[PDB]
Symmetry: C2
Subunit: 120 residues, 2 copies
């Protein structure tokens, strides 16, 4: 039963990496990520607000945020479909910035505090 | 992190019970079920083939199968987000029939056969 949930999550991650049934296509910078709108909504509160504004039959065709690192955005999308304590070598500054812009899980910023405990 | 995956599955199931971002609306009998198309596609390979056929023509799923018990379909969607060998006192016959028509996980029909053999 729980292994079924993990396997359904993996299959949905494969469908998001291939592009099958992508209700939304979010592209902040030159790069373009496309996936289901409900996925980004359940993952990020900013996408949830976009879905609340899109309830009035708007088109989730695209979306752009300034000074939100696109590599960090891709890493955050992957982290929505992946595990915890994932540093992955990106700058914590842009990481916290993107996490806030997407209204992502606060634990990311908590890990940011851990980064502040890593240099002294 | 993985408990987060199970909880995200539960949250997506709550969103599917509410109806947010329903790319398809499947109604077999008198009842009408609405949820995300990608959910049914990831759940069932028959839905995957229907999605491959429907990719060229964005339509509402409105899929209907004769002699496929709609309560069994609702129980199948809910248990698809639940698992854990749920029987729900419904006749195993219609359950196995719908599961076979949908090409659901073989474990469903296997547990049906095990229950039919325990009697």
């Amino acid at each position: 039963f729980p292994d079924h949930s993990r396997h359904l999550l993996q299959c949905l991650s494969e469908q998001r990496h291939q592009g099958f049934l992508c209700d939304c296509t979010v592209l902040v910078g030159d790069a373009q990520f496309r996936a289901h709108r409900a996925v980004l909504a359940s993952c990020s509160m900013y996408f949830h607000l976009f879905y609340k504004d899109q309830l009035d039959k708007r088109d989730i065709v695209h979306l752009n945020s300034d000074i939100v690192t696109a590599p960090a955005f891709a890493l955050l999308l992957e982290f929505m479909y992946e595990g915890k304590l994932q540093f992955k070598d990106l700058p914590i500054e842009d990481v916290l910035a993107a996490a806030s812009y997407l209204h992502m899980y606060d634990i990311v910023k908590v890990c940011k505090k851990k980064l502040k405990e890593k240099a002294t």
